[PDB]
Write an enzyme that holds these catalytic residues in place. Structure first.
Site, mmCIF file in Angstrom:
data_model
loop_
_atom_site.group_PDB
_atom_site.id
_atom_site.type_symbol
_atom_site.label_atom_id
_atom_site.label_comp_id
_atom_site.label_asym_id
_atom_site.label_seq_id
_atom_site.Cartn_x
_atom_site.Cartn_y
_atom_site.Cartn_z
ATOM 1 N N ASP A 163 68.212 36.699 46.734
ATOM 2 C CA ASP A 163 68.820 37.273 47.934
ATOM 3 C C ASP A 163 68.407 36.450 49.151
ATOM 4 O OD1 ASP A 163 69.877 39.045 49.904
ATOM 5 O OD2 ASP A 163 67.915 40.034 50.054
ATOM 6 N N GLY A 175 69.514 27.570 55.769
ATOM 7 C CA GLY A 175 70.709 28.347 56.022
ATOM 8 C C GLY A 175 70.489 29.227 57.230
ATOM 9 N N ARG A 208 75.812 29.717 43.395
ATOM 10 C CA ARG A 208 74.839 29.045 44.264
ATOM 11 C C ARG A 208 73.613 29.927 44.499
ATOM 12 N NH1 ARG A 208 79.256 30.487 47.470
ATOM 13 N NH2 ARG A 208 78.815 32.269 48.851
ATOM 14 N N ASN A 209 73.802 31.236 44.383
ATOM 15 C CA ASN A 209 72.724 32.179 44.651
ATOM 16 C C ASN A 209 72.072 32.678 43.368
ATOM 17 O OD1 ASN A 209 74.598 33.483 47.455
ATOM 18 N ND2 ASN A 209 72.927 31.987 47.429
ATOM 19 N N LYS A 261 59.887 31.075 51.697
ATOM 20 C CA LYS A 261 61.054 31.268 52.537
ATOM 21 C C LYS A 261 60.595 31.675 53.934
ATOM 22 C CE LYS A 261 64.024 34.043 50.717
ATOM 23 N NZ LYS A 261 64.933 35.204 50.492
ATOM 24 N N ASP A 317 76.387 39.068 47.874
ATOM 25 C CA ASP A 317 76.477 37.611 48.000
ATOM 26 C C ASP A 317 76.326 36.910 46.654
ATOM 27 O OD1 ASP A 317 74.745 35.073 50.008
ATOM 28 O OD2 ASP A 317 76.861 35.297 49.484
HETATM 29 C C1 LIG Z 1 70.716 28.322 50.809
HETATM 30 C C2 LIG Z 1 70.877 28.214 49.310
HETATM 31 O O1 LIG Z 1 71.799 28.819 48.745
HETATM 32 N N1 LIG Z 1 69.953 27.415 48.628
HETATM 33 C C3 LIG Z 1 70.022 27.244 47.178
HETATM 34 C C4 LIG Z 1 68.868 26.316 46.818
HETATM 35 C C5 LIG Z 1 67.887 26.438 47.998
HETATM 36 N N2 LIG Z 1 67.026 27.616 47.913
HETATM 37 C C6 LIG Z 1 66.049 27.767 46.933
HETATM 38 N N3 LIG Z 1 65.716 26.734 46.091
HETATM 39 C C7 LIG Z 1 64.746 26.874 45.110
HETATM 40 N N4 LIG Z 1 64.393 25.843 44.233
HETATM 41 C C8 LIG Z 1 64.890 24.529 44.082
HETATM 42 C C9 LIG Z 1 65.950 23.978 44.853
HETATM 43 C C10 LIG Z 1 66.430 22.666 44.612
HETATM 44 C C11 LIG Z 1 65.881 21.819 43.591
HETATM 45 N N5 LIG Z 1 66.419 20.523 43.358
HETATM 46 C C12 LIG Z 1 65.864 19.681 42.274
HETATM 47 C C13 LIG Z 1 66.954 18.689 41.857
HETATM 48 N N6 LIG Z 1 67.314 17.824 43.058
HETATM 49 C C14 LIG Z 1 68.390 16.836 42.712
HETATM 50 C C15 LIG Z 1 67.730 18.677 44.264
HETATM 51 C C16 LIG Z 1 66.599 19.676 44.576
HETATM 52 C C17 LIG Z 1 64.799 22.387 42.830
HETATM 53 C C18 LIG Z 1 64.317 23.706 43.070
HETATM 54 C C19 LIG Z 1 64.115 28.140 45.013
HETATM 55 N N7 LIG Z 1 63.145 28.632 44.181
HETATM 56 C C20 LIG Z 1 62.979 29.886 44.567
HETATM 57 N N8 LIG Z 1 63.802 30.231 45.619
HETATM 58 C C21 LIG Z 1 63.936 31.513 46.339
HETATM 59 C C22 LIG Z 1 63.403 32.724 45.551
HETATM 60 C C23 LIG Z 1 63.228 31.470 47.701
HETATM 61 C C24 LIG Z 1 64.534 29.117 45.914
HETATM 62 N N9 LIG Z 1 65.474 28.997 46.879
HETATM 63 C C25 LIG Z 1 68.824 26.653 49.188
#
Ligand SMILES: CC(=O)N1CC[C@H](Nc2nc(Nc3ccc(N4CCN(C)CC4)cc3)c3ncn(C(C)C)c3n2)C1
Length: 283
Positions: free
Chosen positions: A153, A19, A139-140, A43, A135
């Site tokens: 955040d 993002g 999604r968040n 991150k 925010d």
């Molecule tokens: C910009 C925005 O709003 N986002 C939201 C998600 C991502 N940020 C994120 N994702 C984390 N984990 C995660 C993400 C996707 C999966 N799937 C497993 C299942 N598949 C089909 C698709 C992948 C599995 C785990 C995550 N864990 C911790 N954080 C933060 C605290 C940095 C995360 N941020 C970007």
């Protein structure tokens, strides 16, 4: 506390999402001298025109690291090289919006209402810490396990001074369909405008991931809100649940519920879920 990490101690495995803020990776943290491998989310922040001094970054990190609540994602460590990398708890199941869309047919009233409680508890903790999130959206919110979610955040949250009640924002992109009218019209954010967004987030969950104001242009939103139009009652919601949500979207910010009250009301409901949400085949 804030761990300072060297590049030797962690590794980015794969991209999880990106993002304006930067990029988040699934990663591995192997602290020096210790004998453990810890799955983490890394991150990596986008480079700014005017990078903060390391001291400025460390000061913010210390404060961030002190945010310690079961329903807010914690910062575990930071690495400062050419880029800033924040090492944070990994939420294995991703964001809650995608989770409820993909698992809708197997989500019942107990889970939905427990999630509402957890998000409210995390927001209340943020408010106690004088943090305005700015925010909040499905999604968040991230999923640690199906039974346990955490707010995070991606850069918009702001710390209020001891005597400040409001954050006055500058320009830039804003999630219009989640924002309180006073934020849209005047760029004003408070804990109570977070409550508005909380209500929209709850609506997202109760509709199993429907888009708010689908098809309605973001530019027309403040207009329909001024006319008194709100998001519609989700078919599974009893009137009692919908009224809490509607109360989150009052024009008068101080007429909206407080998060501490939202914890109480949703805790009551989560204790008898099928009374408050009606979902076919719930049991
Ligand atoms: C910009 C925005 O709003 N986002 C939201 C998600 C991502 N940020 C994120 N994702 C984390 N984990 C995660 C993400 C996707 C999966 N799937 C497993 C299942 N598949 C089909 C698709 C992948 C599995 C785990 C995550 N864990 C911790 N954080 C933060 C605290 C940095 C995360 N941020 C970007």
């Amino acid at each position: 506390l804030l761990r300072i990490l060297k590049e030797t101690e962690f590794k980015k495995i794969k991209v999880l999402g990106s993002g304006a803020f930067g990029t988040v990776y699934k990663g591995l943290w192997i602290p020096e001298g210790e004998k453990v491998k810890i799955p983490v989310a890394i991150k990596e922040l986008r480079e700014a025109t005017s990078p903060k001094a390391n001291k400025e970054i460390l000061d913010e990190a210390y404060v961030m690291a002190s945010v310690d609540n079961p329903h807010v994602c914690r910062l575990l460590g930071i690495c400062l090289t050419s880029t800033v990398q924040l090492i944070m708890q990994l939420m294995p199941f991703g964001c809650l919006l995608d989770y409820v869309r993909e698992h809708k047919d197997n989500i019942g009233s107990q889970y939905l209402l427990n999630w509402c409680v957890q998000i409210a508890k995390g927001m209340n903790y943020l408010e106690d810490r004088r943090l305005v999130h700015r925010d909040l959206a499905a999604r968040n919110v991230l999923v640690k396990t199906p039974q346990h979610v955490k707010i995070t955040d991606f850069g918009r949250a702001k710390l209020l001074g001891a005597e400040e009640k409001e954050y006055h924002a500058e320009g830039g992109k804003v999630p219009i369909k989640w924002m309180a009218l006073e934020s849209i019209l005047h760029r004003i954010y408070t804990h109570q405008s977070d409550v508005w967004s909380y209500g929209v987030t709850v609506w997202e969950l109760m509709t199993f991931g429907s888009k708010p104001y689908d098809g309605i242009p973001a530019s027309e939103i403040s207009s329909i809100l001024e006319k008194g139009e709100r998001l519609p009652q989700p078919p599974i919601c009893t009137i009692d649940v919908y009224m809490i949500m509607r109360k989150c979207w009052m024009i008068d910010a101080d007429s909206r519920p407080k998060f501490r009250e939202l914890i109480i009301e949703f805790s009551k409901m989560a204790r008898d879920p099928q009374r408050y949400l009606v979902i076919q085949g719930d049991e």
